[PDB]
Symmetry: D2
Subunit: 180 residues, 4 copies
């Protein structure tokens, strides 16, 4: 059994992903040409996009990562999450760029954004591969967006179903029998 056999439809092809990442990287490269920002990804979903985005971003930058976990309901309410791994370097006075795979409710990411401002970040911006604005549970707008999607039930290029499918080179929708 092969993975493509579980995909009902490719919603965004690899070619489309590659073209958009080239575009976003040039845009971000120009916006931060002056000062080296701290590019941060939240594990695990953001990893593939961050890697390709940053490699298409011709400007000095530092990479870092955080890992967090849910606290149950305060996470599904305020976005507060337990920090499992904090950044390797200080946030104060740095220009932060959060690299995300998808923004739906926006809760956890909003929490992290305002955490970085509490930590006195010079600025905080977000670049997300996919955005789902109809999902918002807080007011949070991404500064850079690859693709605006109608729903979050997709897999690939970082997105998983039961921890699998993150490795697909495109973004697709699963066949119903896979999850039901």
């Amino acid at each position: 059994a092969m993975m493509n056999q579980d995909i009902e439809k490719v919603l965004i092809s690899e070619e489309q992903i590659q073209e958009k990442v080239l575009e976003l990287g040039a845009i971000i490269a120009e916006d931060y040409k002056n000062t080296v920002p701290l590019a941060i990804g939240v594990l695990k979903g953001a990893m593939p996009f961050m890697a390709d985005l940053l490699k298409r971003t011709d400007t000095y930058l530092e990479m870092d990562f955080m890992a967090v976990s849910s606290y149950g309901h305060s996470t599904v309410s305020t976005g507060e999450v337990k920090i499992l791994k904090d950044l390797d370097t200080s946030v104060e006075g740095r220009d932060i760029l959060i690299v995300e795979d998808i923004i739906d409710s926006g809760l956890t990411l909003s929490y992290l954004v305002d955490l970085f401002k509490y930590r006195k970040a010079k600025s905080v911006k977000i670049v997300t591969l996919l955005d789902k604005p109809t999902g918002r549970k807080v007011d949070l707008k991404a500064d850079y967006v690859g693709f605006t999607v109608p729903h979050e039930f997709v897999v690939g290029y970082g997105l998983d179903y039961k921890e699998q499918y993150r490795n697909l080179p495109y973004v697709g929708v699963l066949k119903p029998s896979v999850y039901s």
Copy 2:
């Protein structure tokens, strides 16, 4: 003789060499706060805190490693329903020294939102790091954040931070014992002592 090495985040290794009959007490010039004084103080503070937190189940949090002995003795003299949690942090270097911002190595196991937080500490001096943690808990929407410290050096402050409860105000002496260390040793003393100058240079 005996020796070992440990990690030190301001070097990053220290090698420690001990003589077979060296004893902690001989390194102490004088006892500053005896165990008996400490027992009496935690008894008094615990009854006070038990009264102040009578209507709520607070989350008492200790900042590892130094707060552990005081937190254990204080909480067992605090006769009220409460939960315990712990945090571990790491310095970012010159930037922690000047802002208080630290790396979270171990975050709380439960959420801060809507909780009455009681932070238990061993000593407050510059107050930078503790202040960072207090306002972190407020950013996390705690209902209230209070601090109880065994020792306070309030004129050493680099930020405004008044502890809600303090065991003893300490003057001009470098102390160890009851959680406080010198190169990771002495934390296990049951009293607070003044370390002989020859030990630290």
Copy 3:
């Protein structure tokens, strides 16, 4: 959203009986501290407590151990299948120094199945500890799922659920200065 009612409720009202009183605990902690101090005369051990329950006992025991030593702490969490059957746990907070060449003394609240503790002991051996020993306040050896004998033990207890002195029931009671048994009416799961 959350409302709390304690009224003038006190924890003692929830305790059917005090199993090990504060006085009993302090006398045994003092004896243990003296034995450990003697056993560890010739070395500076790394005493490690496993959060959260071991803390009250660790504080009192080390205060009664008159010998040079370093303290450290670890935090761990379950994986759910391999933990239940092999003791493997996720490390949430590792030690702040290396284990290589150290004499490790693991301070514990109670040992029941001993699966996680066994995992940690052998982890420390893999990390090249010079020695690994265990001191536990309580021991429930009838409950074992692996062969693991503590090197130092305070009290052997039956296979019954207890609280106090670090031990909790739904995150409460850790602050009691004794080990007690809850009234049946108290535990609604």
Copy 4:
């Protein structure tokens, strides 16, 4: 004022890397066709290679990451490191595939490999982008290797100099003036 200006010479081009990654991905997809392994990346340097390698690995897999920090001398002489972020799932009985940017001394990686075997891993294999066997301080052989290199003084594609240059899409050598 651009990163390329700090690069004395491209050792391994983006094109050479993309071609090698395609070849490794196919080999790995084939070797692990029967069971979904746990693909683990050690932050931070392994991230770009891991993302592009797995993307070219057409088989079911789960991704995970670890974060580690030095303890000082013990790290330097035994590879023992402080775990800052452990795996999100258990190792017992899983086939582990560690993805690395470079293996030089091999000390820490050997430590993590034998840690996974202590954790009862069904098997542990390593895929590295770069290999420098002349630099070994323990006998550790990668199962899969992108390129063998004489020395480790290189940047790009995850490899850094003072936390910068990780985002270059190729592997290069810095000009002397960059590190004085």
